[PDB]
Amino acid sequence: TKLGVHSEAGKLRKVMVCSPGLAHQRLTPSNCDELLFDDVIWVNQAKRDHFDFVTKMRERGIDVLEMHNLLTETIQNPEALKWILDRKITADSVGLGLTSELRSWLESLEPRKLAEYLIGGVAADDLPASEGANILKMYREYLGHSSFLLPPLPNTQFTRATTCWIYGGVTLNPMYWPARRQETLLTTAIYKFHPEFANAEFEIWYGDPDKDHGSSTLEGGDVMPIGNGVVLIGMGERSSRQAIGQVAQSLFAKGAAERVIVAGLPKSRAAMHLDTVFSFCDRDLVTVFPEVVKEIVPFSLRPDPSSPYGMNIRREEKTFLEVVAESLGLKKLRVVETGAAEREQWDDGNNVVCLEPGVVVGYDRNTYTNTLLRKAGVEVITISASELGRGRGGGHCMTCPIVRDPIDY
Amino acid sequence: KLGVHSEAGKLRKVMVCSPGLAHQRLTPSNCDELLFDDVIWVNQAKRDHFDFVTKMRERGIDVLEMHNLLTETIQNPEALKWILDRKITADSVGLGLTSELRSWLESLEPRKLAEYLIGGVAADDLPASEGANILKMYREYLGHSSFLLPPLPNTQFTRATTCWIYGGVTLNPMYWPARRQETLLTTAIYKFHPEFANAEFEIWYGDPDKDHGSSTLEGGDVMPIGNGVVLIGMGERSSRQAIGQVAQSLFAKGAAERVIVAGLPKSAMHLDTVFSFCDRDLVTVFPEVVKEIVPFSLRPDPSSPYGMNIRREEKTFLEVVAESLGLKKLRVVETGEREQWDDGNNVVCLEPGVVVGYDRNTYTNTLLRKAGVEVITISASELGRGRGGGHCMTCPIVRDPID
Amino acid sequence: TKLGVHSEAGKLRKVMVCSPGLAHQRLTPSNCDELLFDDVIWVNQAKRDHFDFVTKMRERGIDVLEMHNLLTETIQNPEALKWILDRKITADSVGLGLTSELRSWLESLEPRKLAEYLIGGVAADDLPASEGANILKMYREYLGHSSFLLPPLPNTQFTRATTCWIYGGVTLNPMYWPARRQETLLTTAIYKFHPEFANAEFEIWYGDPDKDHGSSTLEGGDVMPIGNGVVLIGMGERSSRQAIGQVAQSLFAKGAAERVIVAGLPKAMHLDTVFSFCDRDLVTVFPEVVKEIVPFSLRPDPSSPYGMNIRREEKTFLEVVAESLGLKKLRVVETGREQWDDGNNVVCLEPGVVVGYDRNTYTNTLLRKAGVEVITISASELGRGRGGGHCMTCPIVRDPID
Amino acid sequence: TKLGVHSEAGKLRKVMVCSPGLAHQRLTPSNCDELLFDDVIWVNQAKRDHFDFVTKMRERGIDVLEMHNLLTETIQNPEALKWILDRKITADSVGLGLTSELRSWLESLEPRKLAEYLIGGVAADDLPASEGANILKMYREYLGHSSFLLPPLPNTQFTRATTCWIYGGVTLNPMYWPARRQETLLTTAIYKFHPEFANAEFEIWYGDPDKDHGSSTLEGGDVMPIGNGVVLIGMGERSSRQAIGQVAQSLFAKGAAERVIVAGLPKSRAAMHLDTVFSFCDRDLVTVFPEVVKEIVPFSLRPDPSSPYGMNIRREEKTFLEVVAESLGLKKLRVVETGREQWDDGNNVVCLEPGVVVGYDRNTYTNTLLRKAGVEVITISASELGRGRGGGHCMTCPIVRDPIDY
Structure with a gap:
């Protein structure tokens, strides 16, 4: 095409x-x-x-x-999901205590749903019961930190x-x-x-x-x-x-x-x-x-x-x-x-x-x-x-x- | 140690x-x-x-x-190559200026060079060229910083x-x-x-x-x-x-x-x-x-x-x-009190x-x-x-x- | 009541x-x-x-x-309107030379148009062509200042x-x-x-x-x-x-x-x-x-x-x-x-x-x-x-x- | 001249x-x-x-x-001073329950110290103990206000x-x-x-x-x-x-x-x-x-x-x-x-x-x-x-x- x-x-x-x-x-x-x-x-x-x-x-x-649609079909192809997570979920972006847990969980999800999260970010709150999470619930609850694992x-x-x-x-x-x-x-x-x-x-x-x-x-x-x-x-x-x-x-x-x-x-107007x-x-x-x-x-x-x-x-x-x-x-x-006139x-x-x-x-x-x-x-x-x-x-x-x-022309 | x-x-x-x-x-x-x-x-x-x-x-x-260390440091051509290769790219200076600029800095005496490397370089610092001028032009007509290297x-x-x-x-x-x-x-x-x-x-x-x-x-x-x-x-x-x-x-x-x-x-x-x-x-x-x-x-x-x-x-x-x-x-x-x-x-x-x-x-x-x-x-x-x-x-x- | x-x-x-x-x-x-x-x-x-x-x-x-109706009916009392205007249009507010013009025009409007301008402000353009307001448009155009007789x-x-x-x-x-x-x-x-x-x-x-x-x-x-x-x-x-x-x-x-x-x-x-x-x-x-x-x-x-x-x-x-x-x-x-x-x-x-x-x-x-x-x-x-x-x-x- | x-x-x-x-x-x-x-x-x-x-x-x-000086030689004149306090201390400017405390206090001051305050402002602490300044140091306490009765x-x-x-x-x-x-x-x-x-x-x-x-x-x-x-x-x-x-x-x-x-x-905004x-x-x-x-x-x-x-x-x-x-x-x-x-x-x-x-x-x-x-x-x-x-x-x-x- x-x-x-x-x-x-x-x-x-x-x-x-x-x-x-x-x-x-x-x-x-x-x-x-x-x-x-x-x-x-x-x-x-x-x-x-x-x-x-x-x-x-x-x-x-x-x-x-x-985009949600496209993302969703895309994510169903294992190779493409991996191409993203490999880039989105790293020590630098999420932190070493959370890399694995975050990634396994995302992978456990339904295509549509997982797309929502990829475009919509993930909160410590959405994560399944665990510790690495609590530590974030903690910095959020004690320092006023962003509750975002994935912005x-x-x-x-x-x-x-x-x-x-x-x-x-x-x-x-x-x-x-x-x-x-x-x-x-x-x-x-x-x-x-x-x-x-x-x-x-x-x-x-x-x-x-x-x-x-x-x-x-x-x-x-x-x-x-x-x-x-x-x-x-x-x-x-x-x-x-x-x-x-x-x-x-x-x-x-x-x-x-x-x-x-x-x-x-x-x-000025730039x-x-x-x-x-x-x-x-x-x-x-x-x-x-x-x-x-x-x-x-x-x-x-x-x-x-x-x-x-x-x-x-x-x-x-x-x-x-x-x-x-x-x-x-x-x-x-x-x-x-x-x-100024009409x-x-x-x-x-x-x-x-x-x-x-x-x-x-x-x-x-x-x-x-x-x-x-x-x-x-x-x-x-x-x-x-x-x-x-x-x-x-x-x-x-x-x-x-x-x-x-x-x-x- | x-x-x-x-x-x-x-x-x-x-x-x-x-x-x-x-x-x-x-x-x-x-x-x-x-x-x-x-x-x-x-x-x-x-x-x-x-x-x-x-x-x-x-x-x-x-x-x-720092200036002294840098000055001493860039006297080691390899040390200079190391920096310029990272500091002077098409993404940092743009296609039209990476050559005349590296050329012009490579030709400077160490102390002057460390000076710029730290203090940045303005279009004005460069010997006449299209590029320098192109830069001055956007600077004159649009108000962008004329900083090749900020x-x-x-x-x-x-x-x-x-x-x-x-x-x-x-x-x-x-x-x-x-x-x-x-x-x-x-x-x-x-x-x-x-x-x-x-x-x-x-x-x-x-x-x-x-x-x-x-x-x-x-x-x-x-x-x-x-x-x-x-x-x-x-x-x-x-x-x-x-x-x-x-x-x-x-x-x-x-x-x-x-x-x-x-x-x-x-807070x-x-x-x-x-x-x-x-x-x-x-x-x-x-x-x-x-x-x-x-x-x-x-x-x-x-x-x-x-x-x-x-x-x-x-x-x-x-x-x-x-x-x-x-x-x-x-x-x-x-x-x-x-x-x-x-x-x-x-x-x-x-x-x-x-x-x-x-x-x-x-x-x-x-x-x-x-x-x-x-x-x-x-x-x-x-x-x-x-x-x-x-x-x-x-x-x-x-x-x-x-x- | x-x-x-x-x-x-x-x-x-x-x-x-x-x-x-x-x-x-x-x-x-x-x-x-x-x-x-x-x-x-x-x-x-x-x-x-x-x-x-x-x-x-x-x-x-x-x-x-x-409010617009209330004002309207309110300013239909010559008194009320004078009470507001003696206050709204002064020299410190409007500008020593505009006071006359700005008040004359407003006083020649039908209630429902006056009240509106009272709550809505009056711009230089709004005023009948004069050596007065026309100066404000010069400031509004050449200097970028608000052009408001009334804000x-x-x-x-x-x-x-x-x-x-x-x-x-x-x-x-x-x-x-x-x-x-x-x-x-x-x-x-x-x-x-x-x-x-x-x-x-x-x-x-x-x-x-x-x-x-x-x-x-x-x-x-x-x-x-x-x-x-x-x-x-x-x-x-x-x-x-x-x-x-x-x-x-x-x-x-x-x-x-x-x-x-x-x-x-x-x-x-x-x-x-x-x-x-x-x-x-x-x-x-x-x-x-x-x-x-x-x-x-x-x-x-x-x-x-x-x-x-x-x-x-x-x-x-x-x-x-x-x-x-x-x-x-x-x-x-x-x-x-x-x-x-x-x-x-x-x-x-x-x-x-x-x-x-x-x-x-x-x-x-x-x-x-x-x-x-x-x-x-x-x-x-x-x-x-x-x-x-x-x-x-x-x-x-x-x-x-x- | x-x-x-x-x-x-x-x-x-x-x-x-x-x-x-x-x-x-x-x-x-x-x-x-x-x-x-x-x-x-x-x-x-x-x-x-x-x-x-x-x-x-x-x-x-x-x-x-x-200024501080001219204000002192000036503040010397009881009238000069009435005119200023009368406008500076009001129920609107300092409110109902501070007018007197604050004004009386100011007056018991050596002309050049009083000048100091007119221009420098007066905080609650500066005033003697009272129900006034205190139920006022209190606002600055929790509410965290501007302690100045005079700024x-x-x-x-x-x-x-x-x-x-x-x-x-x-x-x-x-x-x-x-x-x-x-x-x-x-x-x-x-x-x-x-x-x-x-x-x-x-x-x-x-x-x-x-x-x-x-x-x-x-x-x-x-x-x-x-x-x-x-x-x-x-x-x-x-x-x-x-x-x-x-x-x-x-x-x-x-x-x-x-x-x-x-x-x-x-x-221009500035x-x-x-x-x-x-x-x-x-x-x-x-x-x-x-x-x-x-x-x-x-x-x-x-x-x-x-x-x-x-x-x-x-x-x-x-x-x-x-x-x-x-x-x-x-x-x-x-x-x-x-x-x-x-x-x-x-x-x-x-x-x-x-x-x-x-x-x-x-x-x-x-x-x-x-x-x-x-x-x-x-x-x-x-x-x-x-x-x-x-x-x-x-x-x-x-x-x-x-x-x-010339």
Whole structure:
């Protein structure tokens, strides 16, 4: 099968999402900052809402893969479970008094259940009667320690972050926060052992859960394979120049890209990702956050054998929207700003995901921008942000495209 | 032979590291980025240091200054290859700069080289090139740090990165990934320096070519008191995962008989911030926290899985240290009448009853000179702005035993 | 008639509430914090869950007063409006040159549009083009300063914060943050001028908007009259002792309270945040905090030069509250199996009936087990404010129990 | 000569200061945020640097007045004292059951010890045993409150802040933070009663410790009467337009000012008063923090007899810097940028006379450049006195300084 993403707007055939669960069920007002999650959510409500989102896509014919599912089938293959536990349960991560007990117990479990735990973490409490456990019940009960043997990954809800399908291949994103790399591990197991991937054909442009990656960090929200051989990558607080360059390089080498346009995010407004200020709705229509987009500094990165490092780089003086338009053959892009005149209230229209040109999934709370997009010709199918939006991320953050056709530029 | 056999024993060989380029680079902006509380007055700060250095040297101690070791160390091409191969990678500098940078550093005279290796390198330091310019460009138009190799201003706190527990040392896996650079440089010295290479000693824990994940251990949390006992602070910076592996390695080589884990209450510091030795039975304390340390004692046991047995002590922390040393009681000096607030913890013993402390802790000082301690004072005005002091600026290497 | 609150579980008969409005429409990720308001909410939705809540009480026969209407009808009295405006629009507040413009325009608006701007703040843009306001837009655009002739008051949504009805008397609380004193004002004028209260029979226990109360701050959340002369009051970051003493002294004057227990909160919070009644002998707590509050009893002491005797309780809070009410022991339900919810801050309609939040499923179930009836509303946008049912209501007429 | 400041860089004749004191000894790492103090300082050492600094202007023949002191000679007058206690001790400020104990106690004190407390604050312990302080040491006991019935006022060390001398007059500044109002109350007692003041000719342009003032606030750091009948009053995080309007309004009505240049200061979360990013070092010399001064959006209120309110405001085009040099009838200011051996922040120095400033030892670079510009730089230690942020300027409230074009 030919997996690959050749756009942002063209018809999405296959996507991967992940429903909230045990991760979020372990969330408290006191532990969410350290667990990297915005705020505590009504988990059963959010599970529902997600199922709604998911179903509106299946309804439209899109194949929609849920991470818990995939993880579950994956774990049933003994080799793949071992590949994970070998990496997740070590002396360094769990402690020498707990390695064995923890691992045997996890292995004693049911596939579905064991997946919940892998994504949702394990508490000393969940462990079967024993001592190594009590010692943790003890540090928790006497010092105020985290009661976590395996820290929960609520950020899995955001499938966009972890991996990036750029044309005919994927990246295994080195995540900023060490903690979050646990997510990338689980997702690699799936891409490595799951039936639907192991046998599919695709490349691996960058990333390796085995290497450390150092100062090199790359994040999903920042990556966009827009078609026409071009790729946009945001360089900010989360995706570094030392990662982007290695990706470009790996790309130009397999002849996978022609040009990579680095969207330089200014330090101020660089505490975010590209897809948080810039989004495609149609082949030539984007929603934009001005204050940041008018300040983004574009750089065209193109291969070159005249270079020992094989690439050439230039700062464009044209604006990002102009550079982006011209990269697509387009005169300019039609732009809907979002995030003072008609706005009944404040709202931020970005991060809506595309199902196909002109058809978008957005948030019900963004009624102002939503209208603006309809007037501009886009069908907006909404979903609830009461619990899902307490993550600031939108449908684009809750999706990792896997298969999606391109368009004529 | 190299080793640290107590906290208050006679100090004969110490390692410190003066402020410098790393600090000259500090800015109110990169201030937190670089994990340093504030921007000090560098030149003034160096003087206070040399002063602190000269004082211990007067008492005859051997004082090794990191820059000197590094400088001597990188004169051994193999020693340099060892570091540059780990410090200059595509992941740390990026594809376009690893060549011109290594080229340019390899061409520097040793002292200048050690300077950068510690103080970092800015785009500006590099001879004109695309790369340098590309870097300057992102710096000019986006505001990113122009640091090819970021500075390591906390090198000045030699206590943090490696720990000499009796006959061996630990190369500590620092909480923050960034500070692991520090530990890289020291390991290099322990590997190639003459005073090290041909020295007899073991490495108890730590490896800079590994990813320890949740295993982290910080200098300020370790204390080989003596009597085959090692005190280790468990807290916001020293994980049990690391700690368990250290006690186990220790026992395994018959280097210690007990590891008393000092459980720091959830109330961001190191044991040595709230507990300092001054004399065989004298310790400065921070009551509020110190009186809330849940004490755990791990001992060797062939009847335990991991091979270790751990038990939660009931008595106060203070008691379980007294009796762990074989003393009835510990003399205690509470800090953190007397005119104004002050914290005089973190002082360093040059030998019994001899401690170097800060000038500003006028109170705590007399409370110690009252307990029969010669409190040799230095300037905290710059070296101390960084919330750190004596014990922190020192990493014992050879300190004779007590009884 | 005779206004008054005699209990925290009695049959609620008259409550004031105030729905989200233009106030929250001005919220922006930047300004919400400099505006003392948690996070930015979806106003239209919030207006709906609010109305749903207001509706759930009116059908149980409760009479419900909403602030916007109250203001409206209130400012339809030339006097009242002058009383607010002479206060709201001054030179120190608005800017020496705008006073005229800003007042002229407001005075030319229909009541229901004026009141809205009163609670919702008036932006430079809102004013008819002038050399006056146009300067502010220059500052708002070129300097990034707030452009508010009048600042929005989104906290008016919590009518529990500005005034308390301590048995046939009310308190005009001097809020902690100075800005929020702008809310106390409008409710005062409403207690003062509106027909509902104007002719009403009730005392004025403490506070005055014309006064600057120094370090004396009091906030609705801590105050709760529980039955016979007893009155609980939190002394934490928001209700200062300077105010507590003067309130208890005052109540001791007209002799409207026998005892005033002062619950000294430990460690950003209020009493009703960790303590809430649902039935005559039932509560909900946040053990961690409740278990650690140092009680203090206040009683009239003729021998005292300042008229009181500040004794201190030796048993625990739940081991005091239960007493001053004669219960054998207080039925306690805890919050603070599924996930995490904070059941506290439930407003009581009558005994055994409580309007709560829908997200706190566990606690609601526990409460139901303890016997309570839980009518729930949505916290999606109203719960984006840390508080709930209790905080969103100012009881004005509740029945006693015994 | 008559009291009044007529420029920022001309011969300084009289200056009021305040050494670090008892308020500073109450600072703990647990409470310097509620008191508005960056960090805990070595008090007796700061006392020596403050004094060092005093000595340096004193030997140059500048009558250096000190607050604790002026407050003692002032507090001498039973009236002066009634006025202060009457406002400092109230049922709102200290509450019902402490008014008398605390006030009686304060009065049984030696004038200079009483001064100590007014500025340094008073804790419960300081008071004799009682039902009062005890059922109050009790709150600090379990509840862990702020033992202070009176809180110290450590920022008193920055006299520039609470009051300003703009030409033949002064302003009793309405501080941003309430807590900081208690300061202005003391300096006011001093201007109202103390000899060197209550018998001197000057005006009270704006201000009143008894009035509310609402959204109208000002901070000494922002105001500068640079001479030529002009007053630079930066608008920002602490000084608001509401206060500036009423200030200039009076400045115009009484004829003490011809134009006021509001320095519209760019939004930024951290304080930032004009004298912390802009400093006069000479008649045509100024230090500057590029990254800010360039963002300043000048405005020029001038009186207008026909206007209702008595003025008119235009938005200057040229840079805030040309709108200033032109404001002094000057061709163009000479600026020294600050903020290359390390990172140096030279702003906030104070002139004693044209071409002679007093700055910090540590800002070796900036100084080097000022000395490159013809400025004599007398330096004082900032190890404790500068752990704050401001320096020379922020620690002085000029009472009599001469006009320039001299």
